[PDB]
Amino acid sequence: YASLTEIEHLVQSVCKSYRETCQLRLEDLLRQRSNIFSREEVTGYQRKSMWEMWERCAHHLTEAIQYVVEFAKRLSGFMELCQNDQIVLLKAGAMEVVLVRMCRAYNADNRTVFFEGKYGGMELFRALGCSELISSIFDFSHSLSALHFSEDEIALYTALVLINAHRPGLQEKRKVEQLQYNLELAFHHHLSKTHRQSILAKLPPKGKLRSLCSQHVERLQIFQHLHPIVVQAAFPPLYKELFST
């Protein structure tokens, strides 16, 4: 039965955990907005091989996932959960948190995302051969950017994307339920202080994040068919563990 003071402290703690495990500082991200890939550089990426483009993207996603694991490790109550549940939560949610986190690196003015040093549009990713997935990812980020999240709101929202008591396989279910509820209280408390509670009805329906992760696993099945050795030899082992079927 968390007090209002304990809830306020939870807001601060989560926001701190997030800031500390942010890959990119928001100021650096902003100071690079006009730094956009040229026609020539975009052509360079489009001309790359499928295997090369996948290998690069797999590396970047894995790096992002590493930061999310660190976020979990610093998140109030997460490390108090049993080993099984920490794993169940991360397996189901790490990619979802990365997808939400991406909106920090997404400039909605020109529909570009910070990728390998500059801002590129989704046409940079053509060689992947998964345009519906890539475009779905860009649309998700765009729809999120329409909410104009603050760093604090992202911190709280991602905590909730991760701490989901309905993940199949949890063993201390009531313990996860309690953490999710307190995080919901913290989120709703922070929103009301800023009169931003209206965003809640505008958050992505959970099916959306699920369809994105599912598309990624499917497109990887197809890539792996075409290039079985690349995955074993070149892809980060964590990536392989989390996404290969």
Binding site: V69, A72, Q83, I87, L90, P237, L238, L242
Partner: peptide, 9 residues
């Protein structure tokens, strides 16, 4: 698993 090791288990 790798997740376990990363969690410090």
């Amino acid at each position: 698993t790798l997740l376990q090791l990363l969690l410090g288990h």
